[PDB]
Structures are given as structure tokens and as C-alpha cells.
Structure 1
Amino acid sequence: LQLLNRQQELNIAKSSAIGNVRIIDNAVTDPNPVRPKKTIIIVIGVVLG
């Protein structure tokens, strides 16, 4: 099974029509969390109450 997977990986590679890939921005983490959104949660709580 591992050799079949390796053969498939090579075969799928060889058909690729894209040139050399150029990493522009490596990953960095935004220090401000995207969730939870505190203010909208508190406003929703107030209005629901």
C-alpha cells in the first residue's frame, strides 16, 4: 500500500502544470484573537434580556 501511495504521489506530481512556487509571506499568528467577539456577545446579552 505504501508503494502504491508513493507511485500515485509521483504520478500526480508529474502532471502538475505549475512552475516554481514562491513563498512570499510565511505564517505568523495574529496576537488579537478572532473569537470570541466580546462586545457583540455582551450587546446581544443586553438586548436579549
Structure 2
Amino acid sequence: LQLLNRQQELNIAKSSAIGNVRIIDNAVTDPNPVRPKKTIIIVIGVVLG
């Protein structure tokens, strides 16, 4: 019986072990590309010339 009592206790603890990490904002994509950074490339090209 004592094993059975522990059997219930382990099951409820396993079922109740939920948390410690939480998702707030789902992944979304910024439509404006981050590379290539056009203007800085053009400025570097001109200055190098």
C-alpha cells in the first residue's frame, strides 16, 4: 500500500510540473531586410573611390 501511495504522489507531481519558461511574443519577421545595408555600402564605395 505504501508503494501505491507513492505511486499516486509521483503521478500528480509529474502532471503538475509545468512552468518556469514562458513565451510572450511569437516569432514574426520584419518585412524590411537587414542586409545588405544599401546606403552604407554606397557611401563606402564612393569614399573608397
TM category (shorter chain) comes to 0.5 to 0.7
Q: What stretches of structure 2 of length at least 5 have no aligned partner? A: none
Moved over 4 A (4+): 1-18
Across the aligned residues of Structure 1 and Structure 2, the Cα RMSD in angstroms comes to 9.5
TM-score (norm 2): 0.58
Identity %: 100
Aligned residues: 49
Answer with 32-41 or 11-20: which moved more. 11-20
Larger Cα-atom Rg: 2
TM-score (norm 1): 0.58
Q: What stretches of structure 1 of length at least 5 have no aligned partner? A: none
